[PDB]
Structure 1
Amino acid sequence: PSMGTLMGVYLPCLQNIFGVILFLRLTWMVGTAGVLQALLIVLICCCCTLLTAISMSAIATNGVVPAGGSYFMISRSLGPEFGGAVGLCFYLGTTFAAAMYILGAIEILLTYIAPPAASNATLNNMRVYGTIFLTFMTLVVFVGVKYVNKFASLFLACVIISILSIYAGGIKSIFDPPVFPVCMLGNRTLSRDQFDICAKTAVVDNETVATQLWSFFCHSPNLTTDSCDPYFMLNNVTEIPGIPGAAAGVLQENLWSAYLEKGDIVEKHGLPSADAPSLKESLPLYVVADIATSFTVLVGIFFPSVTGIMAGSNRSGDLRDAQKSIPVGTILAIITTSLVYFSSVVLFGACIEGVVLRDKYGDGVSRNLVVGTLAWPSPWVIVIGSFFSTCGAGLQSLTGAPRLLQAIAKDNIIPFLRVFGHGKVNGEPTWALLLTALIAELGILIASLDMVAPILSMFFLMCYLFVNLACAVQTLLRTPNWRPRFKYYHWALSFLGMSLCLALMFVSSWYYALVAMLIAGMIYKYIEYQGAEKEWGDGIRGLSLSAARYALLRLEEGPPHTKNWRPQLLVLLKLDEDLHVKYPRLLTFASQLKAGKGLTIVGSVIQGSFLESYGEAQAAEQTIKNMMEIEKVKGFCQVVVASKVREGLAHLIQSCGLGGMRHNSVVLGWPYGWRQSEDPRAWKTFIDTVRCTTAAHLALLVPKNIAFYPSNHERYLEGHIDVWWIVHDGGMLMLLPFLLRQHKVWRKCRMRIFTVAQMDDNSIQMKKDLAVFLYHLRLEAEVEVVEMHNSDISAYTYERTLMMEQRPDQSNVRRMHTAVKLNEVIVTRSHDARLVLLNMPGPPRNSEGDENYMEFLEVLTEGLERVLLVRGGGREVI
């Protein structure tokens, strides 16, 4: 299967756009509203269709295009929810379009072709004949689809012959127009059907005698009477030509709006008329305005003539290269249609009188097609041409709606219409054709183009709005599988299309638009619920699971680094031998530092064997959940059963979360009684966990002396948090006290920034820097710099220099002494502090100097009531 762009995309879209709306209701629309407002309407109705076509192309290019049709692409590229929603609005639009074309064919048959074989009598004739035609067309569609697909070329040929004849007639009008006298009464419009000739008196047998017009206007058959209406005798009777040759005075004439009312009379603005009363037996003698005309009504009546851009991408499977052949073809069809309407609007407006355009049924002329009056060969070619075009459009719509319904039914998206997929032995639908025919009858029972057209418009506008909105949303949030290759495509275009087509959908009828939107929302949510129930198993719980998975998948792609740094903690609790939380203050501290917003996972390892201790794990999980609910901290809880607690801690540290929902901080407690007991396990386990959390580039929070930390009911009134930032990790060391004081427990503790990084430098510049940095934070904490020394900070400087370059025992003995001098300073100037935060030095590289490192950490925090040590990970930015 391989065919080019032309015979695969261009000709079908053109054949679907040229409909009956042009002939039957273009001239009337142009004359009633003028040339300006008509051109503006055409432009407004082409822009929405252009933005929808661009979005449709952006959809049709990303990835491969499914070979099924025009509904499979939408579904595959926008999800089952959207695809299901789009298919149904399109189905309803198609069945009402078939109905409307049947109405057009009936109207053209009973009014101009042959009126003998026929207020509300006309409506009843329309109903009866439309029902008969619908029956016959449904039967034909049942038996003879092959012949329709055979004869489909003829309908386009007829349309082209008709348009060629119209333009040829115009070009012949410019230099030699036809003759079609329309009769006048002052500034009124007479129906030429009854009268033989329009003249008050005629000369018969050497003398004047009253004409049929007289006898119809005056009840007296003798001229010598004075009991007639004043308007007839007061004004004249003229015979102006109806087809004035092309000129700039006529296009100047019919240039301003002429919106009439229901029942008014078609009047020729620009003739002398002296008003007077009139009888009530004369109204059947003037031409009358049939329906109330406005701007929104004309929008609604014209819109079904620019629809069908989804009909071009309808033989997608039998295409050579669809990605490059569908969009260009569709847009070329749009451009051709827009230019044909513009040129025809201007030619009609500028070539025909402003009073004969308003005869919806061609009353001024002797019951002819008003647009058929200007046609070179004869007015009989356009009538037959439009008749065959209407029949063909009806047949093709009745062929193409049931196929869409059958596809949607066999896709098993909406469950209650599975039966509509019981196709024939060949695949042709059976109980979808019946539903379509019944809805078409329900539409025919209205029997008026001016009321069927807005419903059709609502369905199509809803479909287009949905396509555009889906495209824009999927582009904004970076949907995982959505990458279009179109060059001139940008989500701003789809947004503008949504706005314009929404404005149209609301101009026609706000309440109808609300009903359509509610139907669409109901079907969308119902599809979503059914999909959730089918993938997972539950309705409500299934919805939540699906939302979670969607969010995680979308978060997967993209740069995995955030411009800011906020602590997301993982609290490593240590369960007792009796399965009790040893330090229930860690949970309290986590709740005070997070305040219930963010991610907080709470892991714990249970020594033993997994094969025989599963119930223990479940019990411990419930226990931790209860204890965690009490302290009011909202988080998940993981429990693993390892053989040795060390490897359990490792597996917990490096594997907790799903993709992007990872922790970036490990808060572990302090080992108490490590030197007291003879078992040296404690400090080696602690140091091993420290080394394992520093090699994964994670932050570290080691709250020392956890038994003295406040509870949530406690409150502090006087006190000041103390920060003792030594060299590095300034960002997190400044971000912690702020997030802490944001809680009511530390609601008003004064912050004091103590800095010890003299390094033979000046504090004046560092004070200005700290203050300006604090200005953005707005903490405004007092900054004081203590007189620091290089030899005093030697322990930290060694590591700092090594870190800068990257960007033992001799040193350790010195480190202990520096640790004790620093401890002396801090305990003499910050003893009475409420909470003290200072950054700790990194663990040694040598696996044996760990005891000295522990002695350093113990002699450093000697005397301080409450001290929290934080170690940076190195990837923190702010």
Structure 2
Amino acid sequence: YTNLTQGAKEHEEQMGTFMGVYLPCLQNIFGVILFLRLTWVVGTAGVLQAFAIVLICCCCTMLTAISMSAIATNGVVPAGGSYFMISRALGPEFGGAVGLCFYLGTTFAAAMYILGAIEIFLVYIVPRAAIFHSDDALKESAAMLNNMRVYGTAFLVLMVLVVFIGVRYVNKFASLFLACVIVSILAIYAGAIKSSFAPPHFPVCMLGNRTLSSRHIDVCSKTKEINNMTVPSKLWGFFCNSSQFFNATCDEYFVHNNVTSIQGIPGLASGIITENLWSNYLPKGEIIEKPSAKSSDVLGSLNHEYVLVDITTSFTLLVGIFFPSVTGIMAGSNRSGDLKDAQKSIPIGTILAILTTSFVYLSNVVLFGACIEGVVLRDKFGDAVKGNLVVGTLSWPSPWVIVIGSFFSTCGAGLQSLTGAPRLLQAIAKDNIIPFLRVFGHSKANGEPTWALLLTAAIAELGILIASLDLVAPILSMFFLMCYLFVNLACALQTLLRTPNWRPRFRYYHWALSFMGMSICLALMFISSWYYAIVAMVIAGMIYKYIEYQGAEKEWGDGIRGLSLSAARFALLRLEEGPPHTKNWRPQLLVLLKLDEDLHVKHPRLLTFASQLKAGKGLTIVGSVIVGNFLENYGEALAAEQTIKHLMEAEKVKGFCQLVVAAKLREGISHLIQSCGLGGMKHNTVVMGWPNGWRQSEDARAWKTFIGTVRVTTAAHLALLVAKNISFFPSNVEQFSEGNIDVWWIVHDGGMLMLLPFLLKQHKVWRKCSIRIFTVAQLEDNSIQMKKDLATFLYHLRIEAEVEVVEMHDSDISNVRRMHTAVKLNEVIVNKSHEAKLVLLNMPGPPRNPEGDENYMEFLEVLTEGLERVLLVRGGGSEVITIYS
């Protein structure tokens, strides 16, 4: 049946939902707190707050189980247990630091089960085998703690021995460890229902209003008839001198107040639940008393026969003591390779097991408060009911059914933790994620860890030397809550950031359920201590960074450099989806720099102007071509790249250089335009300079390369920016004191001609200029309506530019008519935009047949004649600008 874990030895190498997931999860959730501490949790805090403590802890594990269901429906559910399932779904660095704190929680749970078994042994079975039976004095805790230290060490030593020499017999005894749990739960239900008509007889002796210990007491009368003569009782001797001394010198409060006997279990049909609703938080050392019991109001001495409060108690202390009961939800995955359909079995079996154990916990809170007297619930170790378990007194056939049933339930839960946690630590020693843990993978002939079992014994001996189960249980509650924190955090983080292999195929999963489970784990950690919560999450964060540094060191070769290569890769893969065209166009530049012979930059002011356009943000790529043969020019291309990078730092350009050696200049330019960047991170716009001296020099190749670049750019659906007289453009230390920036918008590309002066004006050079926008009007439309349609187009974006509509005349808006509509258009622009520091206007497209490339180059010379600084702007076709920054 195998409620034990797999771990390694089966990751390198039949069951359904019920016997493969549901019953192994149920066995590991049920345990010692239900039988040894839960009546005391209803005794303190009342029924109403103990119902809230159980409900808060159960909602935390249920949300964590939904995140665990999303992990089991991601990949193919590997055959190694829960550690291999979490590590392959959340990657490394979340497999580690979940596996390490689940390991520490299992190692400290094994100490809590061994201490829980020594308590059922030393109380309730043989209160005679105590080594330190000390003097009858004020130290009743110092001799009890040294009794648990000696017996709990010897119990742990014999239990490491069973894990070593025979673990196959721990496997096949799983069916009777589960049967001891189930018949103990069914005995509590049977004996609570029977108390509606036949309650058991367990009397409690009360002296006035105070609860007396029922040990060392034969009769609760203080009178003690024997045979028609009244010798006073043994209870008389504890509050006076010797038992023949009816004469005098009695204790106060005792001379007053009569001695009565109440029922410890009134049953389900009485109204004792109305007395058990509210809380009884008391400091350590106060007498346990009950309301509706009569008491004078005197003040006597403090006897040794009273039942006192064990420790000081609060709401947050009771949360950390109940919480190890709801853990054990990773048990549904530790038989992963032996399931038929593990993708379907693990969510169904785990979630149903949470609903079963939470019903048993929530219905026991109501049944303890409705059947048991409150002064019996409010003392552990059962001094008021003469040394019985309080939950044992409620069960029908005998209290010995629960005492023997919970002794073997706790002996098997400790044996389960002491095989599981070495098998987990050995599986983290492999995958080589933490290299100094290498020695703890030292498997024997058939799995069987050797040095990992020795380390779990020494850490669990820390939690044996720390005795008192009420102190160990908050320590392992912190480790399990920190384990459930990182699972809930990593599940919601990978679906919000679209981690490449994360796609949970499980309905009723949402990221807001994992975030909600992450918030409850944090709240339960900080109400416990908060300064062990700050330290543990700092230590777990440095473990996250240590595994991430080691993973980057063997993925990229270097640790520190590999952390930037991994961050760049994840961000670039996130962009590879398919809506890349933002409805807010921003120019991402590809700057084309020509090189002359001796390999110097011809026009370095293109880099200055590109730095004023981007202002240190966005993407900028500088592209260049060396004409020649690459097999002979690789050393000349490496030194030419250091020249451009030295020049980019001088002109305050923060970007990338891409240089190529090509046999033709036109071929290397066209390949830079279509292949710069790495997918998503690519250019929007090509920037180049005007070919100055194209007409008068020589052979038609300098100005025909220019037309070929305009054609390649618009075929690629990219934007183009051509700067004319780039040697007259200002440097970075010039700063015009006044001036204009004139935009001549002509029926096309309006969104790009208005964004570009607004972007350029927030640089220091162009800061004090004013934007003027001009349109041309032809007779076959109205001029006034077109103006305020443009004023409203600017006023909602607070660009602050002034608008003029230029009324044109007999004109056209052949070839001699194109050189007549460019002469007329030039004299309108120069009449208004001479002395204007920058002019922006549309450039028209090249002709269809490359026959008219010299008529096109003469068109652009005549149109831009007489202007000092011109930027010709051409849109790519799809540039939607909605928000002007």
TM-score tier, shorter chain, comes to over 0.9
Give the C-alpha shift of residue 789 in structure 1.
5.6
- Aligned AA for 2:261? E
Residue of structure 2 equivalent to 1:105: 117
Q: What is the rounded CA distance, in whole Å, between the counterparts of 2:842 and 2:316 in structure 1?
A: 72
Deviation readout 1:599-625 (Å, 9 max, x if unpaired): 111111011110011111110000111
Deviation readout 1:376-424 (Å, 9 max, x if unpaired): 1111111100000001111111111111111111110101111111111
Instruction: Answer yes or no: is 1:313 the counterpart of 2:356.
Output: no
1:232 equivalent among 229, 254, 258? 254
1:356-367 alignment runs, 5 A limit? 356-367=376-387
Residue of structure 1 equivalent to 2:9: none
Q: What is the rounded CA distance, in whole Å, between the counterparts of 1:715 and 1:248 in structure 2?
A: 93
Identify if the C-alpha distance between structure 1 residues 790 and 430 changes in structure 2 by more than 3 Å, giving closer, same or farther. Answer: farther
Helix, strand or coil for the counterpart of 1:132? helix
Counterpart contact for 2:310–2:379, Cα < 8 Å: no
Q: What is the rounded CA distance, in whole Å, between the counterparts of 1:247 and 1:742 in structure 2?
A: 83
Q: What is the rounded CA distance, in whole Å, between the counterparts of 1:418 and 1:860 in structure 2?
A: 76
Identity %: 83
Q: What is the rounded CA distance, in whole Å, between the counterparts of 2:670 and 2:777 in structure 1?
A: 35
Identify if the C-alpha distance between structure 1 residues 471 and 759 changes in structure 2 by more than 3 Å, giving closer, same or farther. Answer: farther
Residue of structure 2 equivalent to 1:841: 844
Counterpart contact for 2:288–2:375, Cα < 8 Å: yes
- Aligned AA for 1:820? V
Q: What is the rounded CA distance, in whole Å, between the counterparts of 1:560 and 1:790 in structure 2?
A: 45
Helix, strand or coil for the counterpart of 2:859? helix
Instruction: Answer yes or no: is 1:31 the counterpart of 2:73.
Output: no
- Aligned AA for 2:367? L
Identify if the C-alpha distance between structure 1 residues 737 and 229 changes in structure 2 by more than 3 Å, giving closer, same or farther. Answer: same
Residue of structure 1 equivalent to 2:648: 628
Residue of structure 1 equivalent to 2:8: none
Deviation readout 1:480-538 (Å, 9 max, x if unpaired): 22111111111111111111111001111101111210111010000011111111122
Q: What is the rounded CA distance, in whole Å, between the counterparts of 2:857 and 2:246 in structure 1?
A: 134
Give the C-alpha shift of residue 82 in structure 1.
0.7
Residue of structure 1 equivalent to 2:5: none
Which portions of structure 1, spanning 4 or more consecutive aligned residues, are displaced by more than 3 angstroms?
220-226, 788-791
Instruction: Answer yes or no: is 1:176 the counterpart of 2:188.
Output: no
1:99-248 alignment runs, 5 A limit? 99-118=111-130, 119-247=141-269
Give the C-alpha shift of residue 326 in structure 1.
1.0
2:587 equivalent among 543, 567, 570? 567
Select between 66-75 and 766-775 the one with higher mean Cα deviation: 766-775
Give the C-alpha shift of residue 375 in structure 1.
1.5
Give the C-alpha shift of residue 220 in structure 1.
4.3
Residue of structure 2 equivalent to 1:397: 417
Give the C-alpha shift of residue 135 in structure 1.
0.5
Q: What is the rounded CA distance, in whole Å, between the counterparts of 2:559 and 2:349 in structure 1?
A: 44
Q: What is the rounded CA distance, in whole Å, between the counterparts of 1:452 and 1:123 in structure 2?
A: 13
Q: What is the rounded CA distance, in whole Å, between the counterparts of 1:69 and 1:759 in structure 2?
A: 82
Residue of structure 1 equivalent to 2:466: 446
Residue of structure 2 equivalent to 1:802: none
Give the C-alpha shift of residue 222 in structure 1.
4.2
Residue of structure 2 equivalent to 1:804: none
Identify if the C-alpha distance between structure 1 residues 323 and 235 changes in structure 2 by more than 3 Å, giving closer, same or farther. Answer: same
Helix, strand or coil for the counterpart of 1:84? coil
Residue of structure 2 equivalent to 1:805: none
Helix, strand or coil for the counterpart of 1:393? helix
- Aligned AA for 1:120? A
Helix, strand or coil for the counterpart of 2:657? strand
Counterpart contact for 1:704–1:866, Cα < 8 Å: yes
Give the C-alpha shift of residue 226 in structure 1.
3.4
Residue of structure 2 equivalent to 1:855: 858
Q: What is the rounded CA distance, in whole Å, between the counterparts of 1:790 and 1:236 in structure 2?
A: 124
Helix, strand or coil for the counterpart of 1:606? strand
Q: What is the rounded CA distance, in whole Å, between the counterparts of 1:827 and 1:198 in structure 2?
A: 119
Residue of structure 2 equivalent to 1:743: 763
Q: What is the rounded CA distance, in whole Å, between the counterparts of 1:279 and 1:524 in structure 2?
A: 59
Give the C-alpha shift of residue 758 in structure 1.
3.9
Give the C-alpha shift of residue 223 in structure 1.
4.2
Helix, strand or coil for the counterpart of 1:651? helix
Give the C-alpha shift of residue 770 in structure 1.
2.0
Give the C-alpha shift of residue 780 in structure 1.
2.4
Q: What is the rounded CA distance, in whole Å, between the counterparts of 2:833 and 2:503 in structure 1?
A: 59
- Aligned AA for 2:225? V
Identify if the C-alpha distance between structure 1 residues 198 and 759 changes in structure 2 by more than 3 Å, giving closer, same or farther. Answer: farther
Counterpart contact for 2:492–2:514, Cα < 8 Å: yes
Give the C-alpha shift of residue 149 in structure 1.
0.5
Counterpart contact for 1:727–1:757, Cα < 8 Å: no
Q: What is the rounded CA distance, in whole Å, between the counterparts of 2:375 and 2:417 in structure 1?
A: 36
Q: CA RMSD in A?
A: 1.3
Identify if the C-alpha distance between structure 1 residues 301 and 395 changes in structure 2 by more than 3 Å, giving closer, same or farther. Answer: same
- Aligned AA for 1:381? V
Counterpart contact for 1:725–1:754, Cα < 8 Å: yes
Give the C-alpha shift of residue 790 in structure 1.
8.4
2:776 equivalent among 750, 753, 756? 756
- Aligned AA for 1:137? M
Counterpart contact for 1:100–1:449, Cα < 8 Å: yes
Give the C-alpha shift of residue 552 in structure 1.
1.0
Identify if the C-alpha distance between structure 1 residues 84 and 751 changes in structure 2 by more than 3 Å, giving closer, same or farther. Answer: same
Deviation readout 1:806-827 (Å, 9 max, x if unpaired): xxxx2x3321111111001111
- Aligned AA for 2:848? R
Deviation readout 1:298-355 (Å, 9 max, x if unpaired): 1000000001111111111111112221111111011111111111111111011111
Counterpart contact for 1:104–1:390, Cα < 8 Å: yes
1:475-494 alignment runs, 5 A limit? 475-494=495-514
TM score, norm. by length of structure 1: 0.96
Q: What is the rounded CA distance, in whole Å, between the counterparts of 1:544 and 1:28 in structure 2?
A: 55
- Aligned AA for 2:91? G
Select between 154-163 and 675-684 the one with higher mean Cα deviation: 675-684
Instruction: Answer yes or no: is 1:272 the counterpart of 2:275.
Output: no
Q: What is the rounded CA distance, in whole Å, between the counterparts of 1:853 and 1:566 in structure 2?
A: 29
Residue of structure 1 equivalent to 2:493: 473
Instruction: Answer yes or no: is 1:832 the counterpart of 2:854.
Output: no
Counterpart contact for 1:229–1:277, Cα < 8 Å: no
Instruction: Answer yes or no: is 1:820 the counterpart of 2:805.
Output: no
Q: What is the rounded CA distance, in whole Å, between the counterparts of 1:425 and 1:765 in structure 2?
A: 92
Residue of structure 1 equivalent to 2:135: none
Deviation readout 1:116-138 (Å, 9 max, x if unpaired): 11121111110010000100000
Select between 784-793 and 638-647 the one with higher mean Cα deviation: 784-793
Give the C-alpha shift of residue 792 in structure 1.
2.8
Identify if the C-alpha distance between structure 1 residues 409 and 169 changes in structure 2 by more than 3 Å, giving closer, same or farther. Answer: same
Q: What is the rounded CA distance, in whole Å, between the counterparts of 1:478 and 1:755 in structure 2?
A: 47
Helix, strand or coil for the counterpart of 2:702? helix
Give the C-alpha shift of residue 20 in structure 1.
0.6
TM score, norm. by length of structure 2: 0.96
Residue of structure 2 equivalent to 1:798: none
Instruction: Answer yes or no: is 1:47 the counterpart of 2:67.
Output: no
Residue of structure 1 equivalent to 2:560: 540
Q: What is the rounded CA distance, in whole Å, between the counterparts of 1:771 and 1:217 in structure 2?
A: 101
Q: What is the rounded CA distance, in whole Å, between the counterparts of 1:732 and 1:54 in structure 2?
A: 50
Give the C-alpha shift of residue 370 in structure 1.
0.9
Counterpart contact for 1:760–1:790, Cα < 8 Å: no
Select between 646-655 and 65-74 the one with higher mean Cα deviation: 65-74
Helix, strand or coil for the counterpart of 2:595? coil
- Aligned AA for 1:110? L
Give the C-alpha shift of residue 62 in structure 1.
1.8
Residue of structure 1 equivalent to 2:742: 722
Q: What is the rounded CA distance, in whole Å, between the counterparts of 2:113 and 2:99 in structure 1?
A: 21
Helix, strand or coil for the counterpart of 2:124? helix
Instruction: Answer yes or no: is 1:782 the counterpart of 2:802.
Output: yes
Select between 193-202 and 437-446 the one with higher mean Cα deviation: 193-202
Helix, strand or coil for the counterpart of 1:383? helix
- Aligned AA for 2:422? P
